[PDB]
Amino acid sequence: KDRIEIFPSRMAQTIMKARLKGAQTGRNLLKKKSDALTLRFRQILSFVTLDEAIKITNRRVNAIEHVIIPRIERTLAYIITELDEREREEFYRLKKIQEKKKIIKEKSE
Amino acid sequence: YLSQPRLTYKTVSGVNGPLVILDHVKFPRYAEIVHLTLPDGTKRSGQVLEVSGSKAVVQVFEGTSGIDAKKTSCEFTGDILRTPVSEDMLGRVFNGSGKPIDRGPVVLAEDFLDIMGQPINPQCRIYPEEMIQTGISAIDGMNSIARGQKIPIFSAAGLPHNEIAAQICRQAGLVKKENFAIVFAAMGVNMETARFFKSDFEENGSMDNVCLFLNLANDPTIERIITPRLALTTAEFLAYQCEKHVLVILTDMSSYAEALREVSAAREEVPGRRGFPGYMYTDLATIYERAGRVEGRNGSITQIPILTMPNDDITHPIPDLTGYITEGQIYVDRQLHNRQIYPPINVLPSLSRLMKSAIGEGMTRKDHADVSNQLYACYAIGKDVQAMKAVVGEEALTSDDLLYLEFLQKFEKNFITQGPYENRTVYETLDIGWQLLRIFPKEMLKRIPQSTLSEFYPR
Amino acid sequence: YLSQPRLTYKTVSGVNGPLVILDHVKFPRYAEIVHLTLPDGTKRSGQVLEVSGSKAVVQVFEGTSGIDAKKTSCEFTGDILRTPVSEDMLGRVFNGSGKPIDRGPVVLAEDFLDIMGQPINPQCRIYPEEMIQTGISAIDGMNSIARGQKIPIFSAAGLPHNEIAAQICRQAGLVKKENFAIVFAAMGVNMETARFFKSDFEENGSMDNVCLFLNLANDPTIERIITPRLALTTAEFLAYQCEKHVLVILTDMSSYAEALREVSAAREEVPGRRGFPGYMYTDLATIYERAGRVEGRNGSITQIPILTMPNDDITHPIPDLTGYITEGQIYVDRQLHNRQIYPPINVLPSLSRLMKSAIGEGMTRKDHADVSNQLYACYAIGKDVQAMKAVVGEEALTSDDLLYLEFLQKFEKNFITQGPYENRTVYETLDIGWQLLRIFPKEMLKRIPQSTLSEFYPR
Amino acid sequence: QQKKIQMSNLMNQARLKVLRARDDLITDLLNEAKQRLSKVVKDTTRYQVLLDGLVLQGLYQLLEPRMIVRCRKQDFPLVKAAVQKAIPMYKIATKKDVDVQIDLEAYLPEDIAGGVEIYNGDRKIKVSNTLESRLDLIAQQMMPEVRGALFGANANRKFLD
Amino acid sequence: GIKMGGLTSEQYHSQVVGKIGYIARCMQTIDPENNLKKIREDYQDVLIWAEKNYRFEEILEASKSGKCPNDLDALSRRSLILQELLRLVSSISPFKMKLDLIESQYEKMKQHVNLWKSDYHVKLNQLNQLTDYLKNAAPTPKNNFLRAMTSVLQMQIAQYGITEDNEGINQLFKLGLHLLAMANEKIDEQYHLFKGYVKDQPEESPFEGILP
Amino acid sequence: TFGYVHGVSGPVVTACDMAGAAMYELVRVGHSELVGEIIRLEGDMATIQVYEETSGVSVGDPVLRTGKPLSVELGPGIMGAIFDGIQRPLSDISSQTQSIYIPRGVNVSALSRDIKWEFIPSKNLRVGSHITGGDIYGIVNENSLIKHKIMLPPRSRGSVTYIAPPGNYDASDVVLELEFEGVKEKLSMVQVWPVRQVRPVTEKLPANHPLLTGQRVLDALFPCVQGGTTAIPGAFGCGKTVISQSLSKYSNSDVIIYVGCGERGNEMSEVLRDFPELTMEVDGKVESIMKRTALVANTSNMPVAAREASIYTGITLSEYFRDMGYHVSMMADSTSRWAEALREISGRLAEMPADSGYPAYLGARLASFYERAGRVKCLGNPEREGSVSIVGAVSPPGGDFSDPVTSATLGIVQVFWGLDKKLAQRKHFPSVNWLISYSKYMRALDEYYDKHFTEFVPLRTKAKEILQEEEDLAEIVQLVGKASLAETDKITLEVAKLIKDDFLQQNGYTPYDRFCPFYKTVGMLSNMISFYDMARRAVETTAQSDNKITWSIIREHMGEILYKLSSMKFKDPVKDGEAKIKADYAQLLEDMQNAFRSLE
């Protein structure tokens, strides 16, 4: 729906970034296919088969742009935020551990 | 009263961030206020946030820059921050510390109330059953405001949430077809925002019924988390002791949360999300829940705690925890503002928890609830159709889909768009609703029973 | 000189990992160098990291195994780490501690400098001018290095970043339209690569102008921290006091950053972002910014830090914090390496912000700027056409597209592909550029002014 | 091709050869200085003055309530005088009453040119105040000027800052 | 934290004592002979505190106690009016202005809604620009032209004032400022501009009796 | 006033016997006098954060306590000098030492005491008169441009007991003595003010006067006001130099302050080298920009306290001159570098991090920083007024707007001069994005524009409509090729091009286009839009039937008029005066309207 729903991880960052690069490469290659079909279509203006091929190609390109990539970007941003949240709770515990050690050291003096 | 002389100490143990730690204190009291003088004569105040034996930890409001360790002189008031309140605070302008800044005198108290307040006994709390007419169709129709309701406007930096709040202050009436005392907490804002509201209140000719509390961006960040309590404490006096209907507006609550987060970090408290304290919800409830009617008394407090959403993230802890406490939200966005739509109120992600009681027979008009629910269905579907058409193209749509695009386009320009001085009644709003709903055939208006369509749809 | 007899202590409070905690130490300094003598006669070096009263805490460079708290003695020098510098040390090979490992004598000093040094006063910093050619076409005709800039090489693990670094040391020099030296520091280098660097510099006769510091992966991790400081301290002596131009190459700054993280843990500091110290930014700036030209002197220092990107992600704090404070990037790719192209440098994502000043008449050749811009556009287009070919086929291409494919194939084979032992000066690199550009008729070279074409394009 | 590598090895080793020769010259000079210091300590009044100073500097660096001076046996008469004089001078300078003893049971090796070692009361802190150690300390710290004096200044060094 | 405007309690009353002393000083500076009786009367409530030694502290107490006219905004506007009148007569100091015109100019300024943003203020700023430049100026055609034209400008203001708009003075302001901004290297343009003024001036001898 | 070092744990030094010390006081630690601040205090011990390297600091070293907190030294000699972020003169350190390095523990007074300044008393004050804070008691003659007015320090008042006669005094002498309740204070020409404290003003006023920069774009479409705050993106290829030079060279402000926060060494060198070479005509003479400029220089390897403090030192210097009645324009070269320094300190102090690792108070610090700008009514009896503008730049890692530093900045500044790199690649300068840029001061300036120019406001509204429509039509043109396109849309597209080419684009390397006076900017836009309106009417009033006017007919019919419109930018204000240029533009309008008349 809104996210691919992969649990936040550094592994998820690598997978999502590779998935995003793939989607962007496919978008650009299909856009070039559409442009080539559009030029050939205009040159002809086996004519209606080009109009059908263009409509199918543009629909797929639009979905990558409006559905699949936004969804990958939302997933990636979600992962990035949640990972920083996990980093913070580790910081808290480590800070408190250092303070408890300091308290023990003071008591020993 | 307190007849015993207060004690003064020069026993500061040490200073750590915003916290000044005293030792050798006689019977420290928790959450008592301390007044302190710096070696150069500067006077500052703070509150004891911890006591242990002979030690006490004082959080200084103005700040700890310049606090000494040997020459600092502190005195303990012997009580909690109880503040002077009087009826004639209306028409006065105060700072975030409760002191006047309008060149008038200090408050000549009728009593002293605890800034922390007390919870209202839920058995005597009376459930709100009156509607306020805001004049904004985007609100009065689909997200009505009750008297005693808590309804923040969720906004974002750069959006005209200040203009909407200002508009509401002037054209907020009743649907019983009334002078609200406004208490306005301007915290964490620039001069121009505070001057905008101050000027508007005078322009409206209502300044004698407006009490301002100002705490500007260049003021201390610790006072920013008592300013709301000062506003609400006055509101409680006016509403529950003098039976005056009060409207309390708290400016960007996010400056409250950020000020609180700074305090949470300084005190090394357990974080929750985005660095905010794990008790952020409880602290917000202390602010928000000071609202509503009380049985047997003719006053009320209505809140509009507008807040800015960081990065338009509706799941940010600030709007999130607020959404859990308040009775819904108005919610404005950039998609409407970027098209010069005013007010830029997006109804889809909005709600009013007390709205169901507020509408209908005996309150507004019997078809109110039916019109609202169907408008939500048609608006949301139109948004879904745009999401589809963005990919498949207009040629892929059928007549069942184009009708929702026609509704969506006419809805935003007829229902939401109004203008800063367009004041519509709740009845006119519903009439507009029907004009838009009649775009569809009866069979598609699936949220409305035929017992309503047969009367209203023909017109 | 001090002429104060040294004190040696046998008082040890305890030993904890790399640290030895001493007692009863007289007026200890922070960062003081001390020497340990173990019961077995073994000597070790260390540095004082904390001095809390009489309890000095020293980090031992080598392992702490064998150290007791009863017999081990600690001799204090009374001073901090100061490196003996001279011109004669050019042509020598040292380890991280500054000791010779080339069977030569200890450096006979001309002076002693604090390796931490001081920042260069910005008021006397001179904007970079002339160029220092590297001998590698991919980074002379496309992203040249100005005489005074700091431009990093980002590479993934497994790429030949060390072979390029060695090639730069053998080939780099002045344009020559005797006063040029290279200081090379390898941090965390493994034994096999350490041999590669040492032998490759000696065998090819370049050593006379190279000062080589090798800090091996199994060497003390604290020595890895001073290693680049010793290299830069030498560079500053050679460059600014002896009026010559010094190229400083810092290899595997990622391994430096890891050693820095270890030092932070030794101090019991709470880790920052991704485990790295919160001061990693200022530490890297402290190293990188000790470079550039200075007013009134004819010397200069350039830097080419070389960094391995963990998981090949430029977002990682190591390349991110470096790039944020450096001027452009060389950027070594993987696809070019797997295609067996050496050097595997990708010109499309690379950038040299100072190229505008590095090249041009009086510094390299009149046509330098024009050839670079046109080659970049032609390569970017060739890649774009190649991507198109994969979709439309060979028969669907026009004559111009075929010319761009011919350029793309010959550009990588002639311009980028070089070999480790072919030294291409700036003038030969540009001539190769023109040979590739003359593939196209004049009217397709849109980024080269007609005056340049008429002079250089024919013949 | 291989001839180039041979020339590289010859030039690189030739550079090290002359550098090693220069380091031997420095070593020989330092060894002569040590022998000349041996001639100095063979004196009486000049050497006693060195000991008077050395003992004071030892006491001033250690600053402990109790100190023990260890010396070569044959130098004890001279150290004894140095300590008896150093003590009232120490007390005036530091305003601390320190009991300074001389070790009559352990002595420094007789092959040491001269000087003393100073220990604190529990023999856990020692001051390396022998004559040979002081020479090495100064000779190294002053080496940049020895280099210039013997072999000439660096003709390519224009700024001393 | 009374924070009256930008001032705290001590700063507010300190600024009031300053403004009161300042007005007293300006009144003696502008009218040392006390000839301008009507103007003095308008300030009597702050001049009554003059000619007394309060060591600051007693006049400060009078402000805190409420005996002084301690409204900060009234003092700000009333003080500005007086010092702008001082600038009017000060910037034309080589000439004497008639007392009746000084009082007329005073009343017209006093009646302005926002004197600081008035044309009177701007015209006085342009005058000071032209007269301050000449305070330390080398001999040269440009500066001799500017000095000759400035002396006429001062002479005319002494007779007409600033509130009584006069096309002759307004045109001279424009020509003086345009000459001032003229390139120092260019001689012909500044020469023709000066001569243009002299021949267009309604009179026959524009500088006769104006400058030495 | 001395304590002793108890111990060193790195850059943090613990002092003992330092009972009489306040938080955020200043100390000079050790025999090299290392600069640092006291943060935590406990008993008679203090925790000192040392800005510079602590190597060599010993236990038992002295610590010299300085009563003033981090403060800026303000007085004559401030102008033309380059300062460190903690107010250390770099031009004196490099010239008093003959070194290239900033010495560790360097201690050079912010304002030299060997200069004999020409000081003239106000001549209005007398012994026995009453003086209050902000009052001016004399002026120092520094240079031909800026007079340095000597003010009584804030939070001081009393009766004047001594006034120095006119003469030559240095910054160590006594110029004025005043007595308050028996306490005599002897004042020199130099005052000291804590850098984290806001200098008080009588009142904060609305900003109504435009900031008259020399660019047609970033003025006509996106106004800035004196006292206002804006943001400027800082990317290598964005061409930020154009704004920096245009603002510092030709602005109607009096004093320019350029603040570095923590940039690359070579970038600081380019700024330090460029600025001294900039000049402007003033009274017909060409004067160096450095006579009315002050600069604060900080590179990325400067002490983090200085990089963090630099932004506050700059604005403190700005307020100092603001209080003189000057209009001051301060540029922060990169507020992202400042925020980086702030995060570093928060990290070093082991504070709990918030959004993207930044301190919880990041937003509060930016908000309170920018709030210090604005038009004010100054202190002191002279009833003078002035302003501080901020044009601070943002450069977040990656160029994204999600970084809390850029997101917070954009929610605070009222004008955003969004720049782009694509425009630079196309050689279109200044590189202004247009669709991203905005200004929220348009309402504040409506009174100024109405009073002085009248027609400017509807013109800029139409200009934005034309430019926005060109973008809105982009999809139609791409899919059509201007074939199935209305003639009224062709007018919009081609006129929008004219605007983009011969109005919003400005070439600062030409002598005629160095500075575009406002009257010329509105003159050019008026004639272009007047043409637009006439062209729309020519088509629409004839589009019914039989005989209609098209854009091809208009363009072919009056090609000389379209050329004359493009030629308008070449009217050099230096040689062609206001009357001549307006006259030529008036004649163009008449020739233009008459050309259309022949079509009806």
Per-residue DSSP letters for C78-146?
EEE-EEEE-STTTT-EEETTS-B-SS-PPP--SEEEETT---B-GGGEE---SBEE-S-GGGTSSS--B
E2 contact B CB<8A:
yes
Closest chain F residue to the Cα of C78, Cα to Cα: F56
Bridge partners of residue C94, in order along the sequence: C100, C213
Is F333 annotated to bind a ligand? Reply is: yes
- On whether the CB atoms of residues E56 and F158 are closer than 8 A, the answer is yes
Q: At what angle do helices E9-30 and E57-65 cross, to 10 degrees?
A: 120
The amino acid at residue F593 is Q
D150 contact C CB<8A:
no
Is F590 annotated to bind a ligand? Reply is: no
Nearest CB to F348 within list C79, C279, C288: C279
How far apart CA F24 and CA B127 sit, in angstroms, is 52
In this structure, what are the phi and psi dihedrals at residue B176, rounded to the nearest 5 degrees? -75, 70
Closest CA to F409 of F319, F334, F327: F334
- On whether the CB atoms of residues B255 and B266 are closer than 8 A, the answer is no
- On whether the CB atoms of residues E174 and E185 are closer than 8 A, the answer is no
The shortest C-alpha distance from F401 to chain A (Å) reads: 13
- On whether the CB atoms of residues C15 and C60 are closer than 8 A, the answer is no
Q: After which residues are there C–N gaps above 2.5 Å in chain A?
A: 45
Q: At what angle do helices C280-288 and C223-236 cross, to 10 degrees?
A: 30
Domain extent at residue B410:
1-459
Coil/strand/helix, residue F171: coil
| Burial call B414-448: b when 16+ CB within 10 Å, e when fewer | ebbbbeeeebbbbeebbebbbebbebbeeeebebb
Bridge partners of residue F258, in order along the sequence: F295, F331
Q: Do F353 and A92 touch (CB under 8 A)?
A: no
Closest chain D residue to the Cα of F101, Cα to Cα: D161
- On whether the CB atoms of residues B254 and B318 are closer than 8 A, the answer is yes
Q: How many domains does chain F have?
A: 4
Is F508 annotated to bind a ligand? Reply is: yes
In this structure, what are the phi and psi dihedrals at residue C309, rounded to the nearest 5 degrees? -85, 115
Closest CA to F270 of F246, F309, F244, F251: F244
In this structure, what are the phi and psi dihedrals at residue B21, rounded to the nearest 5 degrees? -105, 120
How far apart CA C388 and CA C405 sit, in angstroms, is 11
Is F267 annotated to bind a ligand? Reply is: yes
- Find all residues with CB under 8 Å of F52, minimum gap 6, and list them: F34, F35, F104, F105, F303
Pairing of strands C43-52, C32-37: antiparallel
Closest CA to C88 of F471, B299, D155: D155
How far apart CA B314 and CA B308 sit, in angstroms, is 10
Q: Is the dihedral of CA F103, F108, F111, F112 positive or negative?
A: negative
- On whether the CB atoms of residues F456 and F449 are closer than 8 A, the answer is yes
CATH code, C220: 3.40.50.12240
C396 contact A CB<8A:
yes
Coil/strand/helix, residue F169: strand
How many Cβ pairs closer than 8 A exist between chain C and D? 114
Q: How many domains does chain C have?
A: 1
The amino acid at residue B125 is R
Place of tokens 């985007």: B138
- Find all residues with CB under 8 Å of E163, minimum gap 6, and list them: E104, E105, E108, E109, E120
How far apart CA C78 and CA A1 sit, in angstroms, is 68
- Which tokens is F193 given? 């003010």
How far apart CA F338 and CA D111 sit, in angstroms, is 64
What contacts 24+ positions apart, CB below 8 Å, involve B334-341? B334/B156, B334/B158, B334/B159, B336/B412, B336/B416, B337/B158, B337/B159, B337/B160, B341/B412, B341/B413, B341/B416, B341/B417
Closest CA to F26 of F38, F18, F17, F16: F38
B268 contact A CB<8A:
yes
Coil/strand/helix, residue F231: strand
Is F227 annotated to bind a ligand? Reply is: no
- Together in a domain, F497 and F432: no
Angle (nearest 5°) at CA D96 between D92 and D102? 90
The amino acid at residue F420 is D
| Burial call F62-75: b when 16+ CB within 10 Å, e when fewer | bbebeeebbbbbbb
Closest CA to D5 of B331, F530, C202: C202
Residues 19-38 on C with a CB inside 8 Å of D are: 24, 26
Counting runs of H as helices and runs of E as strands, what totals does chain C give? 12, 20
Coil/strand/helix, residue D27: helix
How far apart CA E23 and CA E82 sit, in angstroms, is 7
Task: Sheet with F82-83: list strands edge to edge.
Answer: F82-83, F293-296, F255-259, F327-332, F385-390, F374-377, F203-205
Q: List chains adjacent to chain D, taking adjacency as at least 3 C-beta pairs closer than 8 Å.
A: C, F
Q: Among F376, F404, F439, give the residue marking a domain's end.
A: F439
Q: Is the dihedral of CA F108, F113, F117, F122 positive or negative?
A: positive
In this structure, what are the phi and psi dihedrals at residue B83, rounded to the nearest 5 degrees? -115, 150
- Which tokens is C179 given? 């006063």
- On whether the CB atoms of residues C381 and C404 are closer than 8 A, the answer is yes
F580 contact E CB<8A:
no
Q: Collect all residues from F whose CB is shorter than 8 A from any CB in A.
A: 350, 352-353, 356-357
List the domains of chain D with CATH numbers.
34-148 (3.30.2320.30)
How far apart CA B205 and CA B195 sit, in angstroms, is 15
Collect all residues of chain E within an 8 Å Cβ-Cβ radius of residue F158: 56
How many whole angstroms from its chain centre is CA B83?
21
Distance between terminal CA atoms of chain E?
A: 60
Is F241 annotated to bind a ligand? Reply is: yes
- Find all residues with CB under 8 Å of C422, minimum gap 6, and list them: none
DSSP sequence for C305-337: -EEEEGGG-TTSHHHHHHHTTSS-B--B-SHHH
How many whole angstroms from its chain centre is CA D95?
28
| Burial call D14-46: b when 16+ CB within 10 Å, e when fewer | ebbeebeebeeebeeebeeeeeebeeebeeeee
Coil/strand/helix, residue F596: helix
Q: Give F165's DSSP letter.
A: P
Q: Give C237's DSSP letter.
A: I
Alpha carbon separation from C326 to C143, C330, F43 (Å, rounded): 14, 11, 45
| D107 CB neighbour count, 10 Å cutoff | 15
Bridge partners of residue F66, in order along the sequence: F26
Place of tokens 């540009």: C430
DSSP sequence for C371-396: HHHHHHHHHHHHHHHHHHHHHH-STT
Is F20 annotated to bind a ligand? Reply is: no
B312 contact F CB<8A:
no
- Find all residues with CB under 8 Å of F536, minimum gap 6, and list them: F488, F491
Coil/strand/helix, residue F309: helix
Q: Among F132, F155, F187, give the residue marking a domain's end.
A: F187
F381 contact E CB<8A:
yes
Question: Please, do chains A and D touch (3+ CB pairs < 8 Å)?
Answer: no
In this structure, what are the phi and psi dihedrals at residue C412, rounded to the nearest 5 degrees? -65, -40
| C49 CB neighbour count, 10 Å cutoff | 21
The shortest C-alpha distance from F573 to chain B (Å) reads: 37
The shortest C-alpha distance from F124 to chain E (Å) reads: 7
C114 contact D CB<8A:
no
D128 contact C CB<8A:
yes
Collect all residues of chain A within an 8 Å Cβ-Cβ radius of residue B275: 88
Nearest CB to F236 within list C148, C269, C353: C353
How far apart CA B106 and CA B113 sit, in angstroms, is 16
Q: Do D159 and C241 touch (CB under 8 A)?
A: yes
> If residue C409 lies in a helix (H) or strand (E), which one and from where to where?
helix C399-410
- Which tokens is F438 given? 């905005």
Length of chain E: 212
- Together in a domain, F540 and F489: yes
Pairing of strands B12-16, B82-85: unpaired
- Which tokens is E131 given? 């007269």
Angle (nearest 5°) at CA F591 between F590 and F595? 115
Q: Is the dihedral of CA F546, F548, F552, F558 positive or negative?
A: positive
The widest CA-to-CA distance across chain C, in whole angstroms, is 88
| Burial call C364-373: b when 16+ CB within 10 Å, e when fewer | bbebbbbbbb
Rg (alpha carbons) of chain E, rounded to whole number: 21
How far apart CA E133 and CA E146 sit, in angstroms, is 9
How far apart CA E173 and CA E149 sit, in angstroms, is 9
Place of tokens 């200004």: F439
Alpha carbon separation from B267 to B17, B59, B263, B264, C197 (Å, rounded): 9, 10, 6, 5, 53
How far apart CA C397 and CA C293 sit, in angstroms, is 51
Q: List chains adjacent to chain E, taking adjacency as at least 3 C-beta pairs closer than 8 Å.
A: B, F
D161 contact F CB<8A:
yes
Closest chain F residue to the Cα of E14, Cα to Cα: F132
For an interface test with F, give the residue of C24, C26, C27, C30 to mutate (most F CBs within 10 A).
C30
Closest chain F residue to the Cα of D159, Cα to Cα: F99
Collect all residues of chain F within an 8 Å Cβ-Cβ radius of residue B255: 364
Collect all residues of chain B within an 8 Å Cβ-Cβ radius of residue E2: 99-101
The amino acid at residue B62 is E
Angle (nearest 5°) at CA C221 between C220 and C223? 70
- On whether the CB atoms of residues B457 and B449 are closer than 8 A, the answer is no
SS3 content of chain E, % helix, strand, coil (to 5): 65, 0, 35
Place of tokens 């400005």: F506
How far apart CA C67 and CA C22 sit, in angstroms, is 12
- Find all residues with CB under 8 Å of D5, minimum gap 6, and list them: C203, C204
How far apart CA E142 and CA E184 sit, in angstroms, is 7
How many whole angstroms from its chain centre is CA C406?
36
Coil/strand/helix, residue F451: helix
Torsion angle, alpha carbons of E163, E168, E174, E175, to 10? -150
- Which tokens is E35 given? 């000839």
DSSP sequence for D121-158: TTS-EEE--BHHHHHHHHHHHTHHHHHHHHH---TT--
Coil/strand/helix, residue F389: strand
Provide the strand spans (E) within F124-206. Answer: 130-131, 136-141, 147-151, 158-163, 167-169, 176-180, 183-187, 191-194, 203-205
- Which tokens is B427 given? 């009845």
Residues 4-23 on B with a CB inside 8 Å of F are: 13-16
How far apart CA B45 and CA C169 sit, in angstroms, is 65
The amino acid at residue B163 is E
- On whether the CB atoms of residues F291 and F144 are closer than 8 A, the answer is yes
Bridge partners of residue C154, in order along the sequence: C307
Coil/strand/helix, residue C234: helix
- On whether the CB atoms of residues F178 and F159 are closer than 8 A, the answer is yes
- Which tokens is C298 given? 């004819």
- On whether the CB atoms of residues C231 and C185 are closer than 8 A, the answer is yes
- Which tokens is C69 given? 């708290």
Question: Please, do chains E and D touch (3+ CB pairs < 8 Å)?
Answer: no
Closest CA to B153 of B169, B164, B167, B141: B164
E212 contact B CB<8A:
no
Closest CA to B247 of B264, B265, B234: B234
Burial of B376 (0-12, 13-18, 19+ CB in 10 A): middle
- On whether the CB atoms of residues C148 and C302 are closer than 8 A, the answer is yes
Domain extent at residue F24:
1-70
Coil/strand/helix, residue B355: helix
- Together in a domain, F416 and F473: no
The amino acid at residue C109 is A
Residues 372-391 on B with a CB inside 8 Å of A are: 387, 390-391
Question: Please, do chains B and C touch (3+ CB pairs < 8 Å)?
Answer: no
Q: List chains adjacent to chain C, taking adjacency as at least 3 C-beta pairs closer than 8 Å.
A: A, D, F
How far apart CA A84 and CA A70 sit, in angstroms, is 21
Q: Give F39's DSSP letter.
A: E
Closest chain B residue to the Cα of E12, Cα to Cα: B103
Q: Resolution, in Å, please?
A: 3.6
**Experimental method reported for this structure:** cryo-EM
Collect all residues of chain F within an 8 Å Cβ-Cβ radius of residue B65: 22-24, 69, 196
How far apart CA B137 and CA B132 sit, in angstroms, is 12
How many whole angstroms from its chain centre is CA A71?
7
